[PDB]
Amino acid sequence: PGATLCLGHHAVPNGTIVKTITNDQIEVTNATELVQSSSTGEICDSPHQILDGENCTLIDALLGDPQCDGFQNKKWDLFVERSKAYSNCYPYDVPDYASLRSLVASSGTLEFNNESFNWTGVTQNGTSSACIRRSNNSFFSRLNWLTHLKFKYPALNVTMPNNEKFDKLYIWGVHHPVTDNDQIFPYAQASGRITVSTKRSQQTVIPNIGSRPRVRNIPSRISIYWTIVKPGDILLINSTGNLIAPRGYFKIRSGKSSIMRSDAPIGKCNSECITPNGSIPNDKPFQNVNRITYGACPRYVKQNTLKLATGMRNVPE
Amino acid sequence: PGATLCLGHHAVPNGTIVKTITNDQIEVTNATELVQSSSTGEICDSPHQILDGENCTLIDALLGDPQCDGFQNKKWDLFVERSKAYSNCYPYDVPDYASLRSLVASSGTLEFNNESFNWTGVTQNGTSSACIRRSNNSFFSRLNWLTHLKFKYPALNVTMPNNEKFDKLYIWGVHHPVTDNDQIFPYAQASGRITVSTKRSQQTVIPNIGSRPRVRNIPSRISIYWTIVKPGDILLINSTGNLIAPRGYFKIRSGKSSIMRSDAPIGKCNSECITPNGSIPNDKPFQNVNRITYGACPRYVKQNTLKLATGMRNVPE
Amino acid sequence: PGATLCLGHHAVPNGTIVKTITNDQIEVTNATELVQSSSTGEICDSPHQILDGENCTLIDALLGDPQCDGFQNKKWDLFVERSKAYSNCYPYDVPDYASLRSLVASSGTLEFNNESFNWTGVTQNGTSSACIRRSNNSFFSRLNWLTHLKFKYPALNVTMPNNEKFDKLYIWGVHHPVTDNDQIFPYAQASGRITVSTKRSQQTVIPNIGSRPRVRNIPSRISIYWTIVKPGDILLINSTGNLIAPRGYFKIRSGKSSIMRSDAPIGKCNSECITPNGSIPNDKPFQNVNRITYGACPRYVKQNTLKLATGMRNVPE
Amino acid sequence: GIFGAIAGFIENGWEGMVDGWYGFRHQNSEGIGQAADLKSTQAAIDQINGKLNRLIGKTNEKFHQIEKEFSEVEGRIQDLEKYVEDTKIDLWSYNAELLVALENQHTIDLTDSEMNKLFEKTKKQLRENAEDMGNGCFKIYHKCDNACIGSIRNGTYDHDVYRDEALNNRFQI
Amino acid sequence: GIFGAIAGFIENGWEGMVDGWYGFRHQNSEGIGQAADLKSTQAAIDQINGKLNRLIGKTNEKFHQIEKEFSEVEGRIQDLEKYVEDTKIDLWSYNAELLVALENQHTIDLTDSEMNKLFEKTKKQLRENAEDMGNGCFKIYHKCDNACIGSIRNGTYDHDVYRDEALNNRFQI
Amino acid sequence: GIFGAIAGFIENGWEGMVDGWYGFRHQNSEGIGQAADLKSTQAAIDQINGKLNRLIGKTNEKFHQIEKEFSEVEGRIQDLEKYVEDTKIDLWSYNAELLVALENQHTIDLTDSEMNKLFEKTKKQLRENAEDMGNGCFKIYHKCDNACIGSIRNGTYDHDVYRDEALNNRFQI
Ligand SMILES: *[C@@H]1O[C@H](CO)[C@@H](O[C@@H]2O[C@H](CO)[C@@H](O[C@@H]3O[C@H](CO[C@H]4O[C@H](CO)[C@@H](O)[C@H](O)[C@@H]4O)[C@@H](O)[C@H](O[C@H]4O[C@H](CO)[C@@H](O)[C@H](O)[C@@H]4O)[C@@H]3O)[C@H](O)[C@H]2NC(C)=O)[C@H](O)[C@H]1NC(C)=O
Ligand SMILES: *[C@@H]1O[C@H](CO)[C@@H](O[C@@H]2O[C@H](CO)[C@@H](O[C@@H]3O[C@H](CO[C@H]4O[C@H](CO)[C@@H](O)[C@H](O)[C@@H]4O)[C@@H](O)[C@H](O[C@H]4O[C@H](CO)[C@@H](O)[C@H](O)[C@@H]4O)[C@@H]3O)[C@H](O)[C@H]2NC(C)=O)[C@H](O)[C@H]1NC(C)=O
Ligand SMILES: *[C@@H]1O[C@H](CO)[C@@H](O[C@@H]2O[C@H](CO)[C@@H](O[C@@H]3O[C@H](CO[C@H]4O[C@H](CO)[C@@H](O)[C@H](O)[C@@H]4O)[C@@H](O)[C@H](O[C@H]4O[C@H](CO)[C@@H](O)[C@H](O)[C@@H]4O)[C@@H]3O)[C@H](O)[C@H]2NC(C)=O)[C@H](O)[C@H]1NC(C)=O
Ligand SMILES: *[C@@H]1O[C@H](CO)[C@@H](O[C@@H]2O[C@H](CO)[C@@H](O[C@@H]3O[C@H](CO)[C@@H](O)[C@H](O)[C@@H]3O)[C@H](O)[C@H]2NC(C)=O)[C@H](O)[C@H]1NC(C)=O
Ligand SMILES: *[C@@H]1O[C@H](CO)[C@@H](O[C@@H]2O[C@H](CO)[C@@H](O[C@@H]3O[C@H](CO)[C@@H](O)[C@H](O)[C@@H]3O)[C@H](O)[C@H]2NC(C)=O)[C@H](O)[C@H]1NC(C)=O
Ligand SMILES: *[C@@H]1O[C@H](CO)[C@@H](O[C@@H]2O[C@H](CO)[C@@H](O[C@@H]3O[C@H](CO)[C@@H](O)[C@H](O)[C@@H]3O)[C@H](O)[C@H]2NC(C)=O)[C@H](O)[C@H]1NC(C)=O
Ligand SMILES: *[C@@H]1O[C@H](CO[C@H]2O[C@@H](C)[C@@H](O)[C@@H](O)[C@@H]2O)[C@@H](O[C@@H]2O[C@H](CO)[C@@H](O)[C@H](O)[C@H]2NC(C)=O)[C@H](O)[C@H]1NC(C)=O
Ligand SMILES: *[C@@H]1O[C@H](CO[C@H]2O[C@@H](C)[C@@H](O)[C@@H](O)[C@@H]2O)[C@@H](O[C@@H]2O[C@H](CO)[C@@H](O)[C@H](O)[C@H]2NC(C)=O)[C@H](O)[C@H]1NC(C)=O
Ligand SMILES: *[C@@H]1O[C@H](CO)[C@@H](O[C@@H]2O[C@H](CO)[C@@H](O)[C@H](O)[C@H]2NC(C)=O)[C@H](O)[C@H]1NC(C)=O
Ligand SMILES: *[C@@H]1O[C@H](CO)[C@@H](O[C@@H]2O[C@H](CO)[C@@H](O)[C@H](O)[C@H]2NC(C)=O)[C@H](O)[C@H]1NC(C)=O
Ligand SMILES: *[C@@H]1O[C@H](CO)[C@@H](O[C@@H]2O[C@H](CO)[C@@H](O)[C@H](O)[C@H]2NC(C)=O)[C@H](O)[C@H]1NC(C)=O
Ligand SMILES: CC(=O)N[C@H]1[C@H]([C@H](O)[C@H](O)CO)O[C@@](O)(C(=O)O)C[C@@H]1O
Ligand SMILES: CC(=O)N[C@H]1[C@H]([C@H](O)[C@H](O)CO)O[C@@](O)(C(=O)O)C[C@@H]1O
Ligand SMILES: CC(=O)N[C@H]1[C@H]([C@H](O)[C@H](O)CO)O[C@@](O)(C(=O)O)C[C@@H]1O
Ligand SMILES: *[C@@H]1O[C@H](CO)[C@@H](O)[C@H](O)[C@H]1NC(C)=O
Ligand SMILES: *[C@@H]1O[C@H](CO)[C@@H](O)[C@H](O)[C@H]1NC(C)=O
Ligand SMILES: *[C@@H]1O[C@H](CO)[C@@H](O)[C@H](O)[C@H]1NC(C)=O
């Protein structure tokens, strides 16, 4: 009579389809998803230091638009800029805005140190009705709008050396007056000019007399520039008019800081990986939530799903 | 006596050599080429909308050089620029030519809408002998060369709002006169200037009096600039002289359009993948025809041939 | 009785641990390192033509700072810039320094051909105490500092055609005077200007009167620009003052030349692959010495070690 | 697939085997039974866990990068920023596709291998006392009670004990 | 290569087998014949078609990109444009090289596997009625006419029918 | 691993085998010996040298590239230069990691295969004159002196010479 002994393997009633080198559809006993495709929809406030810009762009917080006064000297791992943000101070542009935004984002701090520039020959602290601070005409907190002293204005020539261990970042600008109505009122002459130099660098800017399209009812503009001053170097400001002067410098730091455009709410939770859609888990090696990420994140791929077989071929009974 | 039963496999008299992980030359019964290395040499006119620039660069077609009048308002998936192209209107440059060329290429249309700018204080429609249109001195069709009215020229200040759903693209410029022979003739004064602004942007340009090397016998130049005006925004042109004004705006579109430098003839045929050498079939995953491609194309690689084994090892008898 | 015949395989007393798809630590009989992680610390002078900049940057050698006179007309495969380098001629900047440095590096030669520009109306060969050549006030060897002739200075208008087979590279500049102390001394007037044009290009530059922070005790600056002139084209220089004129052109070449920042000493040896740390052998496919390389080099990766098994699994006795 | 056991000479899997991946079914004098083989099961599982350890929880930290969405038309520099990112994503997407296809082919083959190895090991153990019926089953030519079957599963079967009985049964007429 | 049949214990392939990739040659009382095995042939072909379905006609659409040839010397931005493209091309070129080397190694091995599987299946089918001569051939120890050989190729051979005859022939002296 | 010989049914390797990778140990009337098998050894070595020929001394020349270190803060263009290089390095680093893991898995398997092939070849050679003891060893059921063992190693063993002797020993009681 004897016996029979059969070798075999398990099978499951609910197999999963995976791809292989030789077959785009083969059923295995089990598989696991390698592409993260969902977010909870909130940016977790941990473990990265999140700074919600709220109504303020980084640039507005930097310049010191009154509604951004609460941002002074704050730091961030990730600054979050909201699509509802708006400017509410003097209208301006920044040639190469994107670079200034980037280098500040990356620096990861708004630490500002006031410096005493010898401003004689001019009236400091110019204000405007388009930049209301605490129910009173005002200006960008970090800028000093320099105008005449008794219908007179000599050629400014102020110096400031960098004795620190870090790069100083100076933000400064030039006023472009509407007509002669603000050419002979704040500077007392037909013409003005700004030269901001160092041992290594020179930037010179010409003011432009002309009406612009009104932005929050002002038709003049300010153009914003920057200058980095390294240790051992010195900032120099030759100005004959129209200077929007720095009140000091921002610290430049290096580290892991950045900026992200997102409208996702900030939540009280802990997630290493942030996207504009919200934080996502980072167990999987890939993700198709967003190509924009910050932190320890799965890598962005185009596929919605990639199933890794975690069992044998499923051969039902 | 019994029998003999032999198991075996086929072989062929003409095997093909392939590479493997362990051997750079092993003969298999059959293989297929994975690298497309040939073109028929013509760019097929289907299924992509081809626009053969012929004698015209995209920029010349945009500005409206007389020989390019036939291009008005046309669209393309792929604009083809020919090495025989040449300009035959007023000599010009475009600072950041490459970007303007690119953004128009990508927009994929020359749709132009005329606008009525209030030009008073100046003579419109300036012409020249270096831009002959229909056997008569003329100018770029899309530009309006603005000169004096009775040895007089007041400060222009024309506005134009964008109420549309799309970005408007304005092309404009500045004349740089040869000497005083075309400084006091078309503008009636020693000095001129151009400021083209919006709610978000300002570009200001200074004319330059000076002879250039003659190009088609003209030694003055025009410098061409552009300004995109978004919906809800407004274009403003303050000018005190030398303005090469827009006659309207081009529509900016988004889609899959591009531009390619090629001298290949256009043929009456259907091919998804275009290179500068001509269209190529796209059955294979790779190609070594050209790194420049448009359409559904194999990926460019450096190898001339990659043979995928499609049969067993060939072991002849 | 019979016999016993056993099949087996070798093993070694000193196996090596490698990674596999299924196990991060499996012992094999032998393995070889795929990542080059060491340099000898010298840049071998063969087989690439090395040019040690020593105290000179490429730009200083180009302009012709006196201490760089020995570099005239030399060629290189790889120019090596040293961190001890310093400028010792007239203080200057180069807007887009990085591009000029790059295009010269890549060109791989300092071949300079003097040209006879018709300079009448001005005194040539201006010198300074901040650029001492052979114990005598001097200037950049390749630049011609153009000043007045008898308190007078008419509008220069010199032309130079390119009849050669290669792109000419012209280096030129503008003087920015300290005050009126060097505005009325070398040019004889209140104002100056520089326009350097071709058939295809125009660059115009305004001098700037103003004191800079003193660099080697000089507070004026020179700003350096460049212009490439293609065969059949012509250089034109309209100047009304302040011109730092070219004495000729550099040949532009194409080939495999580059530049590298390194302090490694040059040694008398032969190595195809150069990094800033020194030359490295190129037997291995990967390296983690430096992402900056020149020559036939292993590819930079982040791993310090990658062991390729070159034997079977080691199963000791 | 490549060894020929799973989805090959083994006609199908056993849904009723829930305590292991591989094992033994038997019929003898005392009935019909099933037992999982833990060693082959754990061999397969360990290899798959090795793949998982390489792929799960292994992410790369990135911080400040380039912008990847744009509200203005800019031309050359923006074309390059877009092209760099699209290039990157296609290369990673390729890596991910190929990785899964290759790993899956390999997982299917290694699991087939583990079935084959157990089969082979069992065949050799039986020596001249059994024949291979071609479907993963051995006809054992001797009385082989539950303890005897146990002894085969545990690697303690002494083939000499049964050899005379088996030879007699095998080479009868 | 990895299984040892093709270019291993099978000395060579058969140029005369034109209607299949694998099969059987026999010598018996009625002559010497050849028949292709369609199942093993189709198994190999389907796997290779699976690779082809992944690689052929699967291209990616790209439209506006960056410029890749330049008529002017420009420096920094052009260096970057060139470097991005050269970087891309080297990565794709690597992908293509590795893909073909790996797929080819695998195709050679899977085809070897299919030969081995058919051999193994045939061996088990023959039970005690044949011996393996080491070169892919079985010495069958019984009269096995064309229909008998047919029955082996078709998987309908009943080994019990011939077993007494075969044992007698095998274990004679 | 995948074939089951090395670190499987062969309990361990032989440190005393220094003149080959695979071989034979024997015990017979004249003592206990060891000889390397050169063909299997060279088969393994050639395959590994094939991998080495693809990876060693195959570098790519690059010349003028982009800058990769920066002494000034610049923003957009520098972000892109850094991102392109970091992107490149991660893709190459991935290629290198995967290459080594896959090649190593394959080297381990191909070496296991070569052991298995030699075992199999030897088994078939012995025909009915030996049995597989399950640990890589064959019990040979006839007197097999040094020359006889030599004949097995050299592929000149004539199994018919010993068959009557062996059958008698195998199927005794
Ligand atoms: C099909 O295939 C998959 C993969 O092989 C199997 O899923 C795995 O199952 C194990 C055991 O259940 C899981 O291990 C557990 O991991 C938890 C971590 O949770 C998250 O993080 C992982 C990455 O680490 C993510 O992949 C995952 O999605 C989760 O979001 C731990 O919290 C668990 O710990 C608990 O149990 C242990 C006892 O072992 C205790 O020590 C702990 O205190 C605690 O109580 C546990 O370690 C593993 O996460 C699963 N992997 C995946 C990728 O999902 C399926 O089980 C399998 N299906 C079948 C039917 O077999
Ligand atoms: C060596 O290996 C290769 C690959 O395995 C074999 O070549 C394949 O052979 C088949 C059958 O002959 C071909 O199938 C045919 O494809 C045609 C499409 O032509 C183009 O497009 C493909 C991609 O789809 C390109 O790869 C190719 O280069 C062509 O340019 C169809 O038009 C054919 O259809 C015709 O026949 C069918 C019947 O099956 C009818 O239904 C149709 O109406 C029509 O009449 C057909 O489908 C396949 O294209 C080949 N592949 C490749 C990559 O070349 C070799 O045959 C093989 N050599 C040997 C000796 O075996
Ligand atoms: C563990 O695994 C490795 C790889 O399989 C083995 O190392 C190889 O061993 C061979 C033979 O000894 C070496 O071959 C020799 O290469 C020399 C070249 O030296 C450099 O270049 C190679 C690349 O080509 C680098 O990889 C290497 O690091 C060296 O820096 C030649 O000069 C040698 O030539 C000499 O011998 C031959 C005789 O064969 C003569 O013809 C010549 O005239 C000359 O005298 C020789 O060709 C090989 O370089 C080694 N490879 C690697 C990667 O290191 C180990 O041996 C192995 N260990 C064990 C115990 O087996
Ligand atoms: C150059 O042209 C522009 C456009 O015509 C002139 O600006 C316009 O000036 C008017 C009257 O000065 C502005 O009116 C004011 O705007 C608010 C907001 O709607 C309105 O409610 C009030 O009645 C208020 O007076 C108008 O906004 C402004 N338009 C634009 C589009 O900016 C400009 O004055 C001209 N330049 C010179 C020097 O005259
Ligand atoms: C500044 O210098 C340039 C170069 O010397 C002067 O331009 C040159 O002027 C002459 C005469 O005015 C031009 O001649 C004309 O050119 C055609 C084409 O060959 C020729 O056939 C005719 O005879 C015609 O008169 C010449 O082309 C032109 N050369 C170049 C290279 O542009 C320029 O006039 C000077 N500026 C001033 C303000 O004088
Ligand atoms: C604009 O402001 C700057 C800074 O106050 C003035 O430059 C400074 O001028 C003094 C005296 O003219 C320079 O002194 C000289 O420097 C050396 C080096 O230390 C010193 O040893 C000597 O005593 C020598 O006289 C000083 O270096 C210089 N400082 C800087 C930071 O550049 C500049 O003169 C002002 N502009 C005008 C038009 O007055
Ligand atoms: C594209 O242009 C070509 C040639 O262009 C040259 O034409 C010369 C007459 C002159 O304008 C010169 O500056 C320019 O470089 C045109 O071909 C020419 O067509 C004209 C008029 O039909 C003929 O008189 C010429 O024989 C002929 N020249 C050549 C060299 O072929 C061509 O017509 C034009 N194509 C299109 C589509 O407009
Ligand atoms: C490269 O320069 C170094 C040092 O440069 C310094 O030299 C000082 C004298 C002064 O010019 C200072 O501004 C500059 O930073 C040269 O070494 C020097 O050589 C001089 C003259 O031969 C000696 O008097 C010094 O002792 C010596 N100084 C040091 C610190 O070593 C060096 O010669 C030069 N190399 C080449 C190849 O030109
Ligand atoms: C996360 O947000 C991204 C970006 O907004 C989403 O991707 C966009 O989806 C919208 C609407 O479906 C499309 O119009 C855009 O074209 C998409 N952009 C890109 C770059 O793909 C994405 O769908 C969101 N993902 C999740 C999981 O919420
Ligand atoms: C398609 O055209 C390209 C670009 O013109 C060709 O590649 C060039 O070939 C020329 C002449 O052989 C060389 O001087 C260039 O260096 C090549 N350029 C590049 C970028 O490789 C290519 O040979 C053509 N291919 C086909 C199939 O026609
Ligand atoms: C080669 O030099 C490079 C660059 O200087 C070294 O990498 C740097 O090492 C220093 C000190 O350890 C760190 O502060 C830097 O962050 C590193 N830079 C980078 C880009 O990694 C490298 O260590 C040297 N390698 C060898 C083999 O000498
Ligand atoms: C510093 C200064 O002069 N501020 C004045 C400004 C400027 O003249 C213009 O904004 C420049 O165009 O104009 C005001 O009408 C305003 O905006 O409230 C009054 C204000 O005192
Ligand atoms: C609008 C205008 O003024 N056009 C005139 C131009 C310009 O003065 C110069 O081209 C500018 O430098 O010069 C002409 O000789 C010409 O080119 O045909 C006459 C023409 O009427
Ligand atoms: C060509 C020329 O005029 N050179 C003179 C310069 C320049 O006036 C200033 O450097 C420009 O600011 O000044 C000197 O004091 C100097 O530097 O040695 C005297 C020298 O003769
Ligand atoms: C085999 O091993 C199991 C381990 O659970 C044990 O319970 C059983 O008694 C063993 N069988 C025999 C026949 O010894
Ligand atoms: C085997 O199958 C083939 C199918 O073509 C059939 O023609 C043949 O008669 C069969 N052989 C036997 C012996 O039944
Ligand atoms: C087997 O081959 C070896 C080759 O070295 C030879 O020396 C030996 O005599 C051969 N053995 C027999 C039994 O012929």
Descriptors for this entry?
heterohexamer; A: 317 residues; Hemagglutinin (Ha1 Chain), Chain: A, domain 1; seven-stranded mixed sheet; four-stranded antiparallel sheet; 2 helices; 5% helix; D: 173 residues; alpha+beta; Hemagglutinin Ectodomain, Chain B; two-stranded antiparallel ribbon; 4 helices; 13% strand; binds a molecule of 5 linked components (NAG-NAG-BMA-MAN-MAN); binds a molecule of 3 linked components (NAG-NAG-BMA); binds a molecule of 3 linked components (NAG-NAG-FUL); binds a molecule of 2 linked components (NAG-NAG); transmembrane (chains A, B, C); hemagglutinin (chains A, B, C); membrane (chains A, B, C); virus endocytosis by host (chains A, B, C); host cell surface receptor binding (chains A, B, C)
Question: What would your notes on this structure say?
Answer:
The complex is a heterohexamer, with 3 copies of chain A (317 residues) and 3 copies of chain D (173 residues). Chain A is mostly beta strands and 317 residues long. Chain A has 2 helices and 29 strands. In chain A, the strands form 9 sheets. In chain A, strands 9, 10, 13, 15, 18, 20 and 21 form a 7-stranded mixed beta sheet that branches. In chain A, strands 14-19-16-17 form a 4-stranded antiparallel beta sheet, with no helix packed on it. In chain A, β7, α1 and β8 (78-81) form a beta-alpha-beta unit. The two termini of chain A are 27 Å apart. In chain A, 51% of the residues are buried. Chain D is α+β, with helices and mostly antiparallel strands and 173 residues long. Chain D has one domain (1-173): Hemagglutinin Ectodomain, Chain B (Alpha-Beta Complex), CATH 3.90.20.10. Chain D contains 4 helices and 5 strands. Chain D has helices at 38-55, 76-126, 146-153, 159-170, and strands at 22-28, 31-36, 60-62, 130-132, 137-140. Chain D has a two-stranded antiparallel ribbon with strand order 1-2. In chain D, β4 (130-132) and β5 (137-140) form a beta hairpin. Chain D is rod-shaped. Chain D starts with 21 loop residues before the first strand and ends with a helix. At the A-D interface, β1, α2, β22, β27 and β28 of A face β1, α1, β3, α2 and β5 of D. β1 (3-9) of chain C pairs antiparallel with β5 of chain F. Bound molecules: a molecule of 5 linked components (NAG-NAG-BMA-MAN-MAN) (3 copies), a molecule of 3 linked components (NAG-NAG-BMA) (3 copies), a molecule of 3 linked components (NAG-NAG-FUL) (2 copies), a molecule of 2 linked components (NAG-NAG) (3 copies), N-acetyl-alpha-neuraminic acid (SIA) (3 copies) and 2-acetamido-2-deoxy-beta-D-glucopyranose (NAG) (3 copies). The site of one N-acetyl-alpha-neuraminic acid (SIA) has 14 residues of chain C, from β11.
